[PDB]
Amino acid sequence: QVQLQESGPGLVKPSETLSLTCAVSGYSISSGYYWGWIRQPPGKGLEWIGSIYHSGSTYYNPSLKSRVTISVDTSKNQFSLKLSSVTAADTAVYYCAGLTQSSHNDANWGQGTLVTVSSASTKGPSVFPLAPSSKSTSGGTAALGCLVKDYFPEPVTVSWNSGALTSGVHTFPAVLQSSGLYSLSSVVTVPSSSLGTQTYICNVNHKPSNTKVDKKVEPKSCLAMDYKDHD
Amino acid sequence: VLTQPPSVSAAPGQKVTISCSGSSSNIGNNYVSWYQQLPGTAPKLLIYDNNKRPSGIPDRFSGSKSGTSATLGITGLQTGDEADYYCGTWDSSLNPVFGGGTKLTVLGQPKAAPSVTLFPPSSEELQANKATLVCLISDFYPGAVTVAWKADSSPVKAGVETTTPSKQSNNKYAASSYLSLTPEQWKSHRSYSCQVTHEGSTVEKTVAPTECSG
């Protein structure tokens, strides 16, 4: 099927030029009737940014003061948005979208990409395991997790057992600390019995910086290895 | 340019409608589409071509068009329908235009107490001369709590960062609070507590540097 997916740096310095691309798959891009960009600032509605048509004609939102450029690259099968001289008013989730035919308005939409306009520098996170314990044991289940600390900007992605674990998995919304860096935690609920005989690792990806890392998250043993420990 | 009510609410099981009004130059002349947007998610196409549903959209949703206005109908209202809804069409200049959005609230949801999980600082963090207590708060309704930390029996205000509660899938909310300490402070007290107050009732969790469960 037709799929759109945005790419861009999640951080742009004020006055610099924001550059995003939209990768089209399951479709030859030059076939499309319409490709466009829509954005949504936090807690607000949807704003049209600009458009390009099959004919190559481009139209842009007048409120965007000649700052917008949209082009199609057929060799890479993607289209782009360039928005110059950005301010904090341009912080938003940006969506690519398209209509394959003039006769229908069933638009295809990307997933959206968060763009933060800030002078602050990119910072990869520090990851720490959150070991399961008797206190984090309720029923036959055990909570363990990962603390993803002090990063910028949003977002971070966290996966458990490389996607193979999804049930009971809760990755919490991040806090913005007074330092201006984010932290979040991802917890997975598992069976208590599996704790000794299962490997649990959280995979943390901060796309904006080049941070990939995974912590082992395992029970703390409370028996010394160099003394008899069993009856 | 397209206007819809900023908010609508109704009890579960009921039928609800949301309309957007425009001009004969926009809605009057064009197909209208409708979008659903759940927290932290891209708008999802519900209705296109005035009344068609994309595959996978349930027949509880319907679209109609009366003159220069359009209407989204939702039957068998579920808590999972809570979301922002937007109409979209072409304006008189043939460019995209969206309604302002309608926030749909499902009334009469039962109160739900927060589940609280508190983690002590990891050994690795302590080794890096740092210490964070992590208080994770989930599955409450309504989505408002206040969080208080204690060192032994005394309130701690400093080094506390707490999130505004945000909506999750089950429309149960989640929140977290992080207390920053020196490894010495952590290792000097009998314990630390995270106290979560929701609708008059308090749920409390405690961690101690003496703990070793195995």
Author numbering:
A (entry chain H): 1 to 231
B (entry chain L): 3 to 216
Paste lines from the article.
Recently, the novel ‘reactibody’ approach has been developed, which is based on the chemical selection of bio­catalysts from a human semisynthetic Ab variable-fragment library followed by eukaryotic expression in a full-length Ab. This approach has been used to produce a novel organophosphate-metabolizing biocatalyst named the A17 reactibody. The previously designed organophos­phate-metabolizing reactibody A17 has been re-engineered by replacing its constant κ light chain by the λ chain (A17λ), and the X-ray structure of A17λ has been determined at 1.95 Å resolution. An X-ray analysis of both A17 variants has shown that they have a well developed, deep active centre with the nucleophilic Tyr-L37 at the bottom of the cavity (15 Å from the surface of the molecule). In this study, we present data on the effect of a κ→λ light-chain switch on the structure and function of the A17 reactibody.
